Structure 1
Amino acid sequence: HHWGYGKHNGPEHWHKDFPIAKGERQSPVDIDTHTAKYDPSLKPLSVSYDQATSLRILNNGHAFNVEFDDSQDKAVLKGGPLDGTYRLIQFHFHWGSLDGQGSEHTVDKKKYAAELHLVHWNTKYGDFGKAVQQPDGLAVLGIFLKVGSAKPGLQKVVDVLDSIKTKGKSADFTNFDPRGLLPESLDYWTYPGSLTTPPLLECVTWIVLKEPISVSSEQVLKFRKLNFNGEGEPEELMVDNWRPAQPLKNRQIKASFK
Structure 2
Amino acid sequence: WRYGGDPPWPRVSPACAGRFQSPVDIRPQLAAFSPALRPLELLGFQLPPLPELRLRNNGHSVQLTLPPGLEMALGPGREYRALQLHLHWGAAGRPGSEHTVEGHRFPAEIHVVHLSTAFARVDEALGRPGGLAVLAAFLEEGPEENSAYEQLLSRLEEIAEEGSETQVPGLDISALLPSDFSRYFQYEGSLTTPPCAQGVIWTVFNQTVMLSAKQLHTLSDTLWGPGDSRLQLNFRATQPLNGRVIEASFP
TM-score, structure 2 as length reference: 0.91
CA displacement at 1:222 relative to structure 2 = 1.2
Contact 1:140-1:206 at 8 Å conserved across structures: yes
Which structure exhibits the higher relative contact order, with contacts defined as CA atoms closer than 8 Å and separated by 6 or more residues? 2
| 1:43-97 CA distance string (max 9 Å, x none) | 3321224454762101101001101112xxx2111034x7431001100000001
Match of 1:208 among 204, 208, 212: 204
Match of 2:160 among 149, 165, 182: 165
**Within the alignment, does 1:126 sit opposite 2:150 as a pair?**
no
Alignment correspondent of 1:64: 62
Contact 2:187-2:203 at 8 Å conserved across structures: yes
Query: Which consecutive unaligned segments of at least 5 residues does structure 2 have?
Result: none
Alignment correspondent of 1:188: 184
- Cα 1:220–1:121 change in 2 (3 A) is same
Contact 1:54-1:176 at 8 Å conserved across structures: no
Alignment correspondent of 1:88: 82
CA displacement at 1:182 relative to structure 2 = 1.7
Q: Note the 1:168-247 alignment, pairs <5 A.
A: 168-186=163-181, 187-224=183-220, 225-229=222-226, 235-247=228-240
What letter is aligned with 2:60? H
Superposition RMSD in Å? 1.7
Query: Structure 2 CA distance, aligned partners of 1:8 and 1:106?
Result: 24
| 1:168-190 CA distance string (max 9 Å, x none) | 11111231221221212121000
Query: Structure 1 CA distance, aligned partners of 2:189 and 2:55?
Result: 26
Alignment correspondent of 1:101: 95
**Within the alignment, does 1:152 sit opposite 2:147 as a pair?**
yes
Query: Structure 1 CA distance, aligned partners of 2:160 and 2:132?
Result: 29
Query: Which consecutive unaligned segments of at least 5 residues does structure 1 have?
Result: none
- Cα 1:134–1:176 change in 2 (3 A) is same
Q: Secondary structure at the match of 1:221?
A: helix
Alignment correspondent of 1:249: 242
TM-score, structure 1 as length reference: 0.89
